[PDB]
Write a protein that binds this ligand. Structure first.
Ligand code: HEM
Ligand code: HEM
Ligand SMILES: C[C@@H](O)[C@@H](O)[C@H]1CNc2nc(N)[nH]c(=O)c2N1
Ligand SMILES: C[C@@H](O)[C@@H](O)[C@H]1CNc2nc(N)[nH]c(=O)c2N1
Ligand SMILES: C[As](C)(=O)[O-]
Ligand SMILES: C[As](C)(=O)[O-]
Ligand SMILES: [Zn+2]
Lengths: 416, 414
């Protein structure tokens, strides 16, 4: 048969071939020898700080490829406007060492990056993304205004809208624009004397960083952290988000009346802010993006991970389950009710949310659309299948091919 | 080159140096990862009508023998050298060789140990190895299989076992067990195109009737075995009801569950895989242990392409099947897995839940890190089909690679 990866769906018995991977110009962790596909941060993509300007020729080949992708998307490949834009990018790189993107090219690339993200199960929405251009931003203070506008627009009082704000690209001989926090909204994690943590253990370091920069800490489990925004060559400045902008949802359960008394809650807007947006060789170190939550992100990972809120045991005790033995499946029962509480509470509060069943079904539709449109879809199986009820969703039975396509969202080293 | 493996629940880190011993390649490449694929494109094991290359075989043989003598700490000794000369002498004159029972036992255990997809490898050292290499007929195969089943079942106190039939030989048909498992429920494709019984077994069920078996009309009809001796049509052998222990499914609190008439067998015995030791291939080597509850409760009973009983249970539980957000599927699934565990514990039949199993697997990884400097594992298979992140293995990065001895997939005989 064909010379491309054969991908099978074991539920429906259907077969497809991924021809899109052929266009992957970057390598990943795997080798014929061993499969390092489960590693969360394998050292390949890793956009480690490469100070001194990049090879003029390497940037070029990357820029040429992107422009071609752009002209193809508009069905004008090989046209006069295409060849001229190519001549322009080269001329620019030849005299300055870098180049700049036109407005429409940025919008296109931002959407492609999302479209290309192997770990995102919400890609059926890729074509619907509000792209805020913020490449004129010249201060940490201005960064704060743009971000507040982003949160306001994206939150949209509960009827969430996907969006991304793009700050100035990395420049030769100039510091990067950086948002120190991993997400625009994060709960503080306070390191106690007795070794434990109050709040979210995941945010311990950033919480301690805000303190070293002048933040006066609180002492709750759900304290919203301030932002540490960094303009070029300047130390990060602290900014506190107006409570009214940060929409939160108190969690309650549809039938277990005591669940509300737990005082649990979570914020409505999931906005990643520490990832790097790469387009045609240009690197956007600060380009926060946000969509809406898939219920399991909150109910299973954030609230039940042993290294996060770890509320499984407490909730099980309230449901009066036998937590002394594994065969009682007490962990499973509690997790289900907690995830149900998240869904119930968001719907009640009229805030956008999607359960793992709906999400995965929609992702299958996305795979089908992309099979026709591009001959494949890069996907990270371990990240696409939900943390609970895995084989109960359609994606579990779908084989997937993972590879890196550019434009893309990449991990980058912490500024500190 | 040495994978830096990390555990995200504890923050601990280790380096896998064992993968360097891997001489066999996987499907992955630096350009794209295909680890989520179940069966290879061709990594299989092409035909064996001719003798395998002497240099190739001799190399795998010497390596395996080196392995065995390290295991008994007699490496470099005289016996070790005389065994190497024996193997080299035999291969040079016949193009192949044979293993000693002790070596075979060692090889069978290492194969289990090296199985990337097995979560119960903590039990790898406890395996009853039955040497069935002195088998010359389908009928003999059957008797051997019946003894394996009797031994392994052990009145409900399951014991891990493997029976090894004659190795493959150049230019001669293979000994084969056509069934994928020793115990499988029939899949009768009823007119409508739908299926009564286990849909996964529609093909083998067809082949059995085609070879004379008189089918039934139930959802849990135990199939007969199609045993095949070299270059001979497979024969039909019905398994004695007494040998095939089964567990009636009922729920600890929901009284109507038993009414569903659900049931499942006690012994999970894979019989379609190939066992490779030092270059020798054993096309018929059925092995078995005991079930992990999710294999039955989640996959076999709830997979959409299997018994797919999720909705039925939900309707009986009186849940909101109208929408996905009511999490009716997750709810019914948990009760079904609870029923399986309850039932098996009630019938005094060995079983392990996914929580206990993964904790043990974590320990195994630990034991292996100190013993061999690593442990090949396939994350997608190790992590349970439900409550993934609720178990320790989900948060553990894993490295996947091929070590030999090894259990491999092989073409269907027909
Ligand atoms: C519209 C709603 C969306 C949903 C429901 C969704 C859902 C998901 C989920 C479940 C994850 C996994 C989170 C984790 O386990 O860490 C994820 C990862 C990701 N998503 Fe989406 N997504 C959506 C929108 C977005 C948007 C708007 C972008 C970008 C423009 C995006 C980019 C990504 C990327 C790059 C990752 C990988 C992050 C990482 O590697 O940690 N997603 N998404
Ligand atoms: C002691 C009890 C054992 C338990 C609890 C256990 C559990 C498991 C589980 C849950 C799987 C996944 C099966 C699937 O999803 O289809 C598996 C796969 C596997 N196990 Fe074990 N196992 C045990 C004993 C054995 C034994 C005795 C052997 C061999 C001597 C073995 C060899 C393997 C192999 C080769 C696979 C992969 C099979 C395939 O690719 O389909 N296991 N085991
Ligand atoms: C070990 C590593 O593959 C595991 O921790 C991954 C697996 N799935 C997964 N999936 C999502 N969506 N998010 C995650 O953080 C992870 N973690
Ligand atoms: C698509 C394919 O990788 C998926 O169906 C795999 C994943 N995990 C898994 N895990 C186990 N234990 N058994 C299986 O059959 C599978 N199937
Ligand atoms: C808090 As409840 C028992
Ligand atoms: C069996 As109930 C409805
Ligand atoms: Zn891989």
């Amino acid at each position: 048969g064909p010379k491309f990866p054969r991908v099978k769906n074991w539920e429906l018995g259907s077969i497809t071939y991924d021809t899109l991977c052929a266009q992957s110009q970057q390598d990943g962790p795997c080798t014929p020898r061993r499969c390092l596909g489960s590693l969360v941060l394998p050292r390949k993509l890793q956009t480690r700080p490469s100070p001194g300007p990049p090879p003029a020729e390497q940037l070029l080949s990357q820029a040429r490829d992107f422009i071609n992708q752009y002209y193809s998307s508009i069905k004008r490949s090989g046209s006069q406007a295409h060849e001229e834009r190519l001549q322009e990018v080269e001329a620019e790189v030849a005299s300055t060492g870098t180049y700049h993107l036109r407005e429409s090219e940025l919008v296109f690339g931002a959407k492609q990056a999302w479209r290309n993200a192997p770990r995102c199960v919400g890609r059926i929405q890729w074509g619907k993304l509000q792209v805020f251009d913020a490449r004129d931003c010249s201060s940490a203070q201005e960064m704060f205004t743009y971000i507040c506008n982003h949160i306001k627009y994206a939150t949209n009082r509960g009827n969430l809208r996907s969006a991304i704000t793009v700050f100035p690209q990395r420049a030769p001989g100039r510091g990067d624009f950086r948002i120190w926090n991993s997400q625009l909204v994060r709960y503080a994690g306070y390191r106690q004397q007795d070794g434990s943590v109050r709040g979210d253990p995941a945010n311990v370091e950033i919480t301690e960083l805000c303190i070293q920069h002048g933040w006066t800490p609180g002492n709750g489990r759900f304290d919203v952290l301030p932002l540490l925004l960094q303009a070029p060559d300047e130390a990060p400045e602290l900014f506190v988000l107006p409570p009214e902008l940060v929409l939160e949802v108190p969690l309650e359960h549809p039938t277990l009346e005591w669940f509300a008394a737990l005082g649990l809650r979570w914020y409505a807007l999931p906005a990643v802010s520490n990832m790097l947006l790469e387009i045609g060789g240009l690197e956007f170190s600060a380009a926060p993006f946000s969509g809406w939550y898939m219920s399991t992100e909150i109910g299973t990972r954030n609230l039940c991970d042993p290294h996060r809120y770890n509320i499984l045991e407490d909730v099980a005790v309230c449901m009066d389950l036998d937590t002394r033995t594994t065969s009682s499946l007490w962990k499973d029962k509690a997790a289900v009710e907690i995830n149900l509480a998240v869904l119930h509470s968001f719907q009640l509060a009229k805030v956008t949310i999607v359960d793992h069943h709906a999400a995965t079904v929609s992702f299958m539709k996305h795979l089908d659309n992309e099979q026709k449109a591009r001959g494949g879809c890069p996907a990270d199986w371990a990240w696409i299948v939900p943390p609970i009820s895995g084989s109960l969703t359609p994606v579990f039975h779908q084989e997937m091919v993972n590879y890196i396509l550019s434009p893309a969202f990449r991990y980058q080293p912490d500024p500190w």
